[PDB]
Structure prediction request, 666 residues.
Amino acid sequence: LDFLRDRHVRFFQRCLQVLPERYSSLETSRLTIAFFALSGLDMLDSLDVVNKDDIIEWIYSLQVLPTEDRSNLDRCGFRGSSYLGIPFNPSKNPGTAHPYDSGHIAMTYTGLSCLIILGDDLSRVDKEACLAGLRALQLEDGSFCAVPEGSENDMRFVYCASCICYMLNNWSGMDMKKAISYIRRSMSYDNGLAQGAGLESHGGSTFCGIASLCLMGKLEEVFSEKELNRIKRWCIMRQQNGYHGRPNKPVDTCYSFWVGATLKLLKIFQYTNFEKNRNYILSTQDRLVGGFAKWPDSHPDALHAYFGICGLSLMEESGICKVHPALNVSTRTSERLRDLHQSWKT
Amino acid sequence: TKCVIL
Amino acid sequence: FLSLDSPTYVLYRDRAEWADIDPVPQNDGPSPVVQIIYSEKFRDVYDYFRAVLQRDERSERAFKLTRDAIELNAANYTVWHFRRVLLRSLQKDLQEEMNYIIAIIEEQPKNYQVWHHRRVLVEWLKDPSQELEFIADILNQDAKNYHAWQHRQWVIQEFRLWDNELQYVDQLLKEDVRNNSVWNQRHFVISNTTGYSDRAVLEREVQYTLEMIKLVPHNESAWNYLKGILQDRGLSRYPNLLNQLLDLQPSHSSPYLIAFLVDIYEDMLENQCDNKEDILNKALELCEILAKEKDTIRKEYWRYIGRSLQSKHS
Ligand SMILES: *C/C=C(\C)CC/C=C(\C)CC/C=C(\C)CCC=C(C)C
Ligand SMILES: [Zn+2]
Prediction:
């Protein structure tokens, strides 16, 4: 019915506190759950209800710093959590060598992203080490892996790489030419972007692709006007009321951001139907515990709560900050990041 | 149910 | 060996074979964030896992420990990596590991780590003999599982197994002509074998799609395929298509058809066609039909498209 702002604020507060053993599968990616919650509070202008200082220390304890002999540069970045059992060290002393300890691209991304949201200035971030680690993750085809030990590679990680380079304001972290090639090669016959060449185009990968190009500032350069028109068509066809991620699939709240943000970057979100979208998103709101679910009368989670709110933000919901569609942080945060970049250039 | 992104 | 729910299950801290190892606990510092609470049993398994990892112990007991860690949480990518390290060190029977992962994936078909693990195994064995059947089983519980289709394309390409895919595709399109994943697979097979440059193939495909469209006219996937295989050749270069579509409009109408027409007319305008000002009017007329009555939800979009055509061809 209406936006239960306070309820959602408590929801995110709880997420930062303690989770039931039934969310153990998120252990190695707790940092992204932190992001969903922090960025979600930021989006609701409630970052005051948390101790920015404690959380900043926690995040820094997750950074994989290079060792004395700088022999582990290709493995630096951030961890999803402390699951490896390394002694709590908030980026103070050097690096305590460990056979299997290394960063995860999605954690380096959400980590830096969280630090900026909390006001930190990234002075304790070994920028060169992170960039070195990033480079190590890129494959011949231009895409990226999540960890140096090996993993699947797709558009999700291309977006992570792009965000990292953007925030550290240094693109030496990737071979941009090859990344762009990968993004082009992922365009389907139906004109959407897929996780990789030949695969079914999808709302999530289309967002990752388009947002990556925007972050590099090369959308126009990479896709022709005819091409962009075709992509726009594929994207806007995703709205049913709310948005689905693929043709002939039921809608899901989070696509209101994935696809909506893409439409925004392509400058035609304004031509979508706001009311039906807003109504759907709200219909998935959990009026009892707060947060949003993928479908109405479904269990809520951090991911849908955050993206449902960002989806609402795209339409300027009363009480929600404007979201930076490509960086996935509040404009306030994106602005603060600009100030930060300026200060460095001295 | 839920969405797996990682 | 010893199941996690066996009446005689024993914590690792109470097992004689593990007495020489000092368990390593996880610590999130003074003020923990998004901290997950773990049961005695769960924390026990992982406290020993950390210990074994930290020492890179390539032992048989470590290998068995991973099975338990994986049961507690199959999304821990580090556990899977270490298990692979052990598979090599102990030179374990990979054919058996295939059975293991085959079961794990059936219970967790949307997990990234399990699909990655299976792919590494198939690469090691250079044996794709059981892949297509396995994937078909998974696609049977969820015909749109992105992980399954992704793996299926990898196998088919890596070991060149195209011989029966187009037939598999035809079968699934019969089971559900609306499955967007299957239409994508169809284009994957064809463009990687015969290609679409053979006028005979193009004709077979355009004809096949129109047949499917006639069966279920309101199917975005079918229309997207039809437009997909022709858009780069030039929609205006197929005069009989334009009329065959206009003939469907009477009964088999849908926003997809109307849209296709608009795209045909636009290709014409883009190619200095005859009676330009007349074509543009035919287009605009359709854009408005879409906005006002056929695809109302995209009302502002279609009118936006209309304004675009006018300011470009006048
Ligand atoms: C139901 C929703 C699903 C399956 C997810 C679709 C979205 C995708 C694949 C985008 C994934 C993007 C990633 C991993 C990079 C950004 C990560 C974070 C914001 C945590
Ligand atoms: Zn979702």
Residues A 32, 106, 110, 156, 159-160, 204, 208, 252, 254, 258, 328; B 3-6 surround geran-8-yl geran (ligand 1) (CB under 6 Å). Chain B is about 0% helix and 0% strand.
